[PDB]
Design a protein around this ligand. Sequence first.
Ligand code: CLA
Ligand code: CLA
Ligand code: CLA
Ligand code: CLA
Ligand SMILES: CC(C)=CCC/C(C)=C\CC/C(C)=C/CC/C(C)=C/CC/C(C)=C/CC/C(C)=C/CC/C(C)=C/CC/C(C)=C/CC/C(C)=C/CC1=CC(=O)C(C)=C(C)C1=O
Ligand SMILES: CCCCCCCCCCCCCCCC(=O)OC[C@H](COP(=O)(O)OC[C@@H](O)CO)OC(=O)CCCCCCCCCCCCCCC
Ligand SMILES: CC1=C(/C=C/C(C)=C/C=C/C(C)=C/C=C/C=C(C)/C=C/C=C(C)/C=C/C2=C(C)CCCC2(C)C)C(C)(C)CCC1
Ligand SMILES: CC1=C(/C=C/C(C)=C/C=C/C(C)=C/C=C/C=C(C)/C=C/C=C(C)/C=C/C2=C(C)CCCC2(C)C)C(C)(C)CCC1
Ligand SMILES: CC1=C(\C=C/C(C)=C/C=C/C(C)=C/C=C/C=C(C)/C=C/C=C(C)/C=C/C2=C(C)CCCC2(C)C)C(C)(C)CCC1
Ligand code: OEX
Ligand SMILES: [Cl-]
Ligand SMILES: [Cl-]
Ligand SMILES: [Fe+2]
Lengths: 44, 37, 36, 36, 38, 341, 29, 40, 502, 35, 60, 35, 32, 78, 64
Amino acid sequence: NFNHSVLDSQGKVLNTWADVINRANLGIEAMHERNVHNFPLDLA
Amino acid sequence: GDAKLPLWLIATVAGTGVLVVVGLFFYGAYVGVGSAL
Amino acid sequence: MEVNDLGFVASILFVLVPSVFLLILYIQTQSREGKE
Amino acid sequence: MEVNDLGFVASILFVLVPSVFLLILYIQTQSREGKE
Amino acid sequence: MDRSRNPNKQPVELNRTSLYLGLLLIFVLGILFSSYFF
Amino acid sequence: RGWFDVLDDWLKRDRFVFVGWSGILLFPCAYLSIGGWLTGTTFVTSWYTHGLASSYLEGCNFLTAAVSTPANSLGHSLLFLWGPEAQWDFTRWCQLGGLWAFVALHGAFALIGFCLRQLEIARLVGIRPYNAIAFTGPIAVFVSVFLMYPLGQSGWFFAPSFGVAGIFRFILFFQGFHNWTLNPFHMMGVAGILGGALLCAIHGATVENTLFEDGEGSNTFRAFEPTQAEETYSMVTANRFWSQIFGIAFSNKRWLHFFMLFVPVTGLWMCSIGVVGLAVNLRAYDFVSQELRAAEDPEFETFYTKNILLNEGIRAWMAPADQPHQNFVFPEEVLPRGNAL
Amino acid sequence: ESVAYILVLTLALGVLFFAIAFREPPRIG
Amino acid sequence: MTPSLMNFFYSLLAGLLIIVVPATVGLIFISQKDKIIRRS
Amino acid sequence: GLPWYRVHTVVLNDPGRLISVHLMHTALVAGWAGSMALYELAVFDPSDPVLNPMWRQGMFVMPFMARLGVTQSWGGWSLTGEVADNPGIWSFEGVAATHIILSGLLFLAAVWHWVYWDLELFTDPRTGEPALDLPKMFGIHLFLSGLLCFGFGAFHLTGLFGPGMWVSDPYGLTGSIQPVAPSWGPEGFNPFNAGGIAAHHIAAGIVGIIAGLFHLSVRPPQRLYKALRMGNIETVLSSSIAAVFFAAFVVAGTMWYGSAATPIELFGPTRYQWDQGYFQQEIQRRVQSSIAQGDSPSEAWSKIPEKLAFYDYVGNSPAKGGLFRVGPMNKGDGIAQGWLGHPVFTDAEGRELTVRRLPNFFETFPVILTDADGVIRADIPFRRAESRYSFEQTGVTVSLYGGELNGKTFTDPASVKKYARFAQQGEPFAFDRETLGSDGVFRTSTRGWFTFGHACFALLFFFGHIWHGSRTIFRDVFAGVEADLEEQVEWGNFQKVGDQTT
Amino acid sequence: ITYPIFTVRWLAVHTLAVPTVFFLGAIAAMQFIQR
Amino acid sequence: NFMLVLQAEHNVLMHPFHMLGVAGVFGGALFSAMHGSLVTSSLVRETTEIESQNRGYRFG
Amino acid sequence: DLRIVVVLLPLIVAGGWALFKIGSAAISQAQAFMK
Amino acid sequence: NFELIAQLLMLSLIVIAGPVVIVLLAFRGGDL
Amino acid sequence: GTTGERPFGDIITSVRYWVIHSLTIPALFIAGWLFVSTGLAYDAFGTPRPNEYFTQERQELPIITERQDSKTQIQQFI
Amino acid sequence: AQRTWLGDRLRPLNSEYGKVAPGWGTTPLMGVFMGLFFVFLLIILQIYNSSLILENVSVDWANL
Ligand code: CLA
Ligand code: CLA
Ligand code: CLA
Ligand code: CLA
Ligand SMILES: CC(C)=CCC/C(C)=C\CC/C(C)=C/CC/C(C)=C/CC/C(C)=C/CC/C(C)=C/CC/C(C)=C/CC/C(C)=C/CC/C(C)=C/CC1=CC(=O)C(C)=C(C)C1=O
Ligand SMILES: CCCCCCCCCCCCCCCC(=O)OC[C@H](COP(=O)(O)OC[C@@H](O)CO)OC(=O)CCCCCCCCCCCCCCC
Ligand SMILES: CC1=C(/C=C/C(C)=C/C=C/C(C)=C/C=C/C=C(C)/C=C/C=C(C)/C=C/C2=C(C)CCCC2(C)C)C(C)(C)CCC1
Ligand SMILES: CC1=C(/C=C/C(C)=C/C=C/C(C)=C/C=C/C=C(C)/C=C/C=C(C)/C=C/C2=C(C)CCCC2(C)C)C(C)(C)CCC1
Ligand SMILES: CC1=C(\C=C/C(C)=C/C=C/C(C)=C/C=C/C=C(C)/C=C/C=C(C)/C=C/C2=C(C)CCCC2(C)C)C(C)(C)CCC1
Ligand code: OEX
Ligand SMILES: [Cl-]
Ligand SMILES: [Cl-]
Ligand SMILES: [Fe+2]
């Protein structure tokens, strides 16, 4: 993951293509197998 | 000219010249502006 | 307008599959006539 | 169960009328050899 | 005004094994596209 | 000679790189858009087009570096250095979309200039071209994804962005917003490429499995003459091999090579006419069936309705972050969340 | 509506059988 | 005269004056110097 | 013999039946255009041209004969709503009918040249082999096409001996037939001005005349005749297909973006009416012109016609519709019944707020409700554990202004969910999804299906241009190469590649 | 024996090498600088 | 449905061993149409024009 | 704009070494093909 | 830093310490 | 066979190639070093500096709203 | 070789076959009509893009 990789001298997060990848990848992760997950990590 | 020198020798120093400038890039993912550090 | 929902399947295979049977058998005769 | 009401017309002419085109041309070719 | 005979019209030569390629190609397009016609 | 024949005796010399009388369209337009792309990865950037940091100068390590796009509010205007878009002053030209249109058109015209080139050497050695026929695979991918996909839709922000991850966004764009898998014109292309990848792998095996003992050393490709009329692989043992194992076998050595031309070139051409349906977004994501008793019937449980809710996971999650043109902002309970995740 | 695949799937499987039995035998000349 | 016409018209000046004439003079005044030999 | 993909190469030598093999193809396309448009007249529903117009009925060919001056349909239902009388011979039943009998008279002439060839016209006098002159004939083909465009420019589109093309107003309301004036300036170059299309074929026809008047008189040069291989039939065919692909890109373009030659009343809105909200810039303008007159919005939103409300619908935008969601647009929605007004959303406080959402390349936009500057005030909560912007806590009301269901508010938040999704699709519309068996998911118009079927085919005609362009240049090498040629290919050998003089 | 120094390939190989090591000196310097 | 889960659950595309695979596959896509084109190009003449040029030799 | 000056100073010592070290043979190669 | 350059000293000593065994064999005439 | 010009294994073998490449390929390398250490690529090419993304008056992720002018807006976006 | 009334009025339109203008011909008349045509195609492409926008054109749906 290159999530939150480049950043300002503030620390404000600059978007890359990799978190635009991850904003698509958050969505299928938060929707696949939509009933079984009762605990907030899908590490199984 | 007759100053020819074995290519194999300069095959090393051009090859490790290639190796240090791509070895410096993998150093640069770990400190700098893109490292999230 | 009402329709039987399946005659257009039925009367397009009733007309074609014996005629392309018949259209198969005319070409072969032409080749035989040629002697090739 | 829902259906498009016309695919069984469509996918029975999509499969047949190029294959009986192809089945015409083999029996065109194979009957030329055979010593008339 | 008066008919003649053609010095032309070469016939066609579709092979036995080339029938199998064309018959298979229509049947994979049959099993591909028949869902989309429904 | 004349005035023009002296020039045609220049460019058809045996120089070591062949320059080509069709190469004067290629060699300007192919050093630009390679070297136009190679500044767009390093120096010029996004973040004035759609709010992204996509350069080596901002510091992304090449697996998210790309020269992107112009903005969505900018239309389909070709961003000339000299046009209305910018009136030269390329500082402001560069970061206002723009750069890519420098490498989209030059990348289009060099692909004309390369397919003109392999036609041009094919007459000089007199060789009957099929490489230009087999380049119609590659040229129909480029002019129908990077050129004719955005001109059906809105302006060139929705065109793919030139990088490895800029393509990877455009992949997951086409999953969610269009379902580019499971329309049939894409799925012939997977039969084209993966069928093409076998037929060079399986043909690369058997010429190295049937060899003919002209060498006395132990490696095989010593003492293979290039001026050798006798053929180096068997084709009689190779046909006897594949008539037994697979049951079907190439019973003549030509059309073994014509099939290797045909199987990925007609793969890309069927893949090329799918995205022109996606250009006007005739997507075929929906089935006319299998949805009404996804509405009436919770007992009807299938993979396709499982798959179509995954694409809703795309279209409301990445779309505020992919396109900041509309300023889409979402209040975090309108997003489709399945459960505890 | 459902037996249109199993029509055309078995024709696609049927031509797999007829290419193994009734191939042209390749004769060396 | 309009400020987008002349901004287009300066391209047809410069796309001529930089690309075309240094291609034409840049080809024919070197090919005519290195003429090929037909006498073998 | 020959393989199956090289069947038509029998006609490549003799041009005796080459006239005949176009002429059954010409009878097949003319015997399509009558045979389709007569079917296309069998399903019209002419009872309501404002609510379901003729592009709503999925109708490919009856804009194209309609957009040149023909509206007499034989039943007395004029297309434009002003069918004055018996149309005369030129109605759709008529033009469609002619293309049947013309294709019959094309087919009877198509069978004539097949049995009769060598009619003393296809051979040279130098020997008896069949060969026809192509560049002298290009001067007599194009001079006829140069006459026919100059006929089409002045003598048809300008009222001299013919009715004009279709021209509407912007925001297409009163589109009818009137003869347009050929505007000669720069204003005729923007395609939304119809005065260029009349000035088109006069100016292109007169240079089509001065081309073919020139092209008969001169001969091609031998530095081109051996270069372009102009004696060969195949080269000309390749050139024609390549040119055609170029011509199919522009009507892939100018149908999709829109022009004066592609108006709204017979093609629909043109997909860029949501990306700026083009029609929503007008109905919003006229009600604020109405309150500038000083009218209340309940009895305003009523001098808006329903035609302007019908163009502000997602379900007439041609983006939506898929590849295999097959049929007319009336299989997607049913028949448009009534407008039922425009929703105006208010909270418990005012704070007016609106829905302007659903862009084109979505399928399921989540419903948001926002204020003037962009802060969200209401949505549809997908997870009601931690809602803070739901409909029920905020208590949003609906003011439904104008239309069929004018003045009917809704304070129950179970019914606000229906009109919020209706506000996503511009203005709502009443339908009937039982008379045609309409399912409920979207289709696309005739403007959508044209540009799919004219840019995918134009891709395919690019490959034939590479293929026929190869076979003209490479005719001699086409059945394989001469055997060795190892001195031509090995390097350094003098001098320039392909020269036999080193 | 004797070969010419400059040719078409001297210009073909310097193009995409003069902008290579000028860019290789560009990229090797940017990791040393920081936010 | 499997592949989008693998892109979801642990991210296929930004991984170099997958990226070495498509470089083999797209390379294997081209090299089928590269090698298969050029021998089909450089074929010798043994037939005439009217028949298939895939006939003038015998198998083996 | 003093910073453009220091960055082209290795650009001009690049060609400045190309004058002195090879260029005696370059004018003899510019003496070639009789032009 | 002092013991970062001595690390990269201990790189740059030890890498070309390899091929100086090769060139010293290839120029004294030792059978390679 | 031959082409006419000097082969590559004959070029690098010549010591005259390395007198014109002991002081030139480091010279073109150090010119790339000064293209970014002086910060000229920040000014010449349009790259924002890694402190000058967001100003005090702007935290709202800049994009070009209108295509038609598109030049006074970037100077308004600084 | 069958003479008709039709074919005795078009055989002088198809009497010659390889009659050809001499070497290199009227090529640059066709070249300068091509270079005028490409410039005309380049003008109308940016009329339609609104990148050679003029006064009083306004390529838009405000038209007649
Ligand atoms: C089993 C997996 C599989 C396979 C084999 C394929 C196969 C294919 N996909 Mg696909 N796909 C898949 C899964 C798969 N898909 C999945 C799961 C998704 C997500 C839903 C997608 C989404 C997807 C998209 C979105 C697209 C494809 C496309 C394609 C085609 C590739 C086009 C191509 O190579 O052009 C390669 C590119 C060119 C030929 C352009 C010319 C470039 C030239 C040749 C190179 C220039 C060289 C130059 C010197 C530069 C190099 C130097 C550089 C390093 C600096 C091919 C049919 C494309 C397609 O079909 O469109 C037509 C397409 O757009 N795929
Ligand atoms: C203006 C159009 C046009 C014309 C007149 C020709 C003419 C010709 N082509 Mg050609 N071609 C074209 C466009 C055209 N082409 C295009 C657009 C492509 C790209 C797809 C090709 C690709 C192509 C190839 C690859 C080859 C030819 C060949 C030939 C020659 C023999 C054709 C034959 O026997 O096929 C007879 C065809 C059949 C028996 C059936 C084919 C099955 C098709 C798919 C059915 C068509 C569907 C439907 C009926 C048509 C509706 C679509 C239509 C509205 C466009 C002939 C000179 C061959 C050649 O080289 O000979 C010289 C050859 O090998 N063509
Ligand atoms: C380009 C010409 C054109 C245009 C745009 C349309 C468009 C339309 N027609 Mg139409 N039609 C056409 C030609 C065309 N037609 C022709 C030639 C005929 C005569 C056969 C008809 C007969 C016809 C009828 C009878 C009806 C329509 C109707 C319709 C409308 C409904 C939408 C639809 O059916 O799309 C559906 C489109 C598809 C499902 C896409 C098909 C994609 C094909 C199958 C892909 C082929 C791939 C190929 C097999 C692979 C190649 C193999 C590879 C190895 C090379 C739509 C406006 C209907 C309507 O509204 O009328 C009232 C209607 O009832 N059409
Ligand atoms: C990949 C693309 C490609 C390839 C390989 C070919 C190949 C061929 N074409 Mg062809 N052609 C193409 C695309 C292509 N064409 C396109 C897109 C068109 C326009 C529809 C044409 C129109 C065309 C005609 C009319 C003829 C050919 C002919 C030929 C053959 C001879 C070579 C020749 O004269 O080339 C032609 C050279 C080109 C197409 C290159 C054009 C490059 C232009 C001049 C540069 C313009 C750049 C400009 C500054 C930028 C403006 C655009 C900007 C707004 C983005 C050859 C088979 C001839 C033929 O059939 O042989 C007998 C012939 O008469 N072509
Ligand atoms: C109940 C049941 C059965 C259900 C099954 C249904 C189901 C789940 C799946 C089936 C559905 C299905 C098949 C879908 C696919 C549909 C689809 C995409 C079809 C392709 C259609 C199409 C137009 C594609 C475009 C691209 C195209 C033409 C691809 C063709 C692919 C193709 C034929 C690839 C060939 C692969 C292959 C077998 C390669 C090996 C070749 C081979 C045997 C070489 C042998 C060989 C090698 C040598 O080296 C030598 C020397 C000799 C001598 C020799 O011989
Ligand atoms: C376990 C051992 C047995 C294996 C069982 C499975 C073997 C199947 C072999 C394929 C059958 C022959 C097909 C080609 C028919 C045929 O006769 O081919 C013949 C052809 C060789 O042709 P020739 O060399 O004889 O051609 C002579 C020339 O004159 C051409 O005319 O072989 C191929 O081209 C192989 C490439 C295509 C192979 C396609 C494979 C398709 C796999 C099945 C896909 C559809 C399945 C649908 C399921 C729903
Ligand atoms: C834009 C433009 C332009 C242009 C420019 C150019 C054209 C430039 C060039 C550029 C270039 C032309 C560049 C290049 C680059 C390259 C690079 C940067 C590369 C890198 C690489 C690498 C780093 C790699 C490495 C490696 C590895 C990793 C391993 C193996 C080996 C190798 C070596 C491959 C101008 C200004 C004129 C004008 C305006 C427009
Ligand atoms: C004898 C005669 C006659 C008659 C005529 C007629 C009756 C004709 C007909 C005509 C017709 C009856 C026409 C029509 C045609 C049609 C067509 C020709 C069609 C075609 C189709 C197509 C071509 C298609 C294709 C496709 C498909 C398959 C699907 C979709 C896609 C596509 C497009 C691919 C009369 C008595 C008058 C007079 C005397 C003479
Ligand atoms: C004249 C002639 C000729 C030729 C012949 C031929 C060879 C013809 C062909 C023709 C053709 C080639 C025709 C075709 C037509 C078309 C058709 C017959 C089709 C129709 C179809 C359709 C209509 C389809 C489908 C469908 C249905 C039914 C259902 C669903 C929907 C749709 C629409 C898709 C010659 C010169 C030799 C001589 C003698 C006479
Ligand atoms: O379920 Mn089948 O899946 Ca591949 O991840 Mn872990 O657990 Mn779920 O996740 Mn994300
Ligand atoms: Cl799931
Ligand atoms: Cl869990
Ligand atoms: Fe082989």
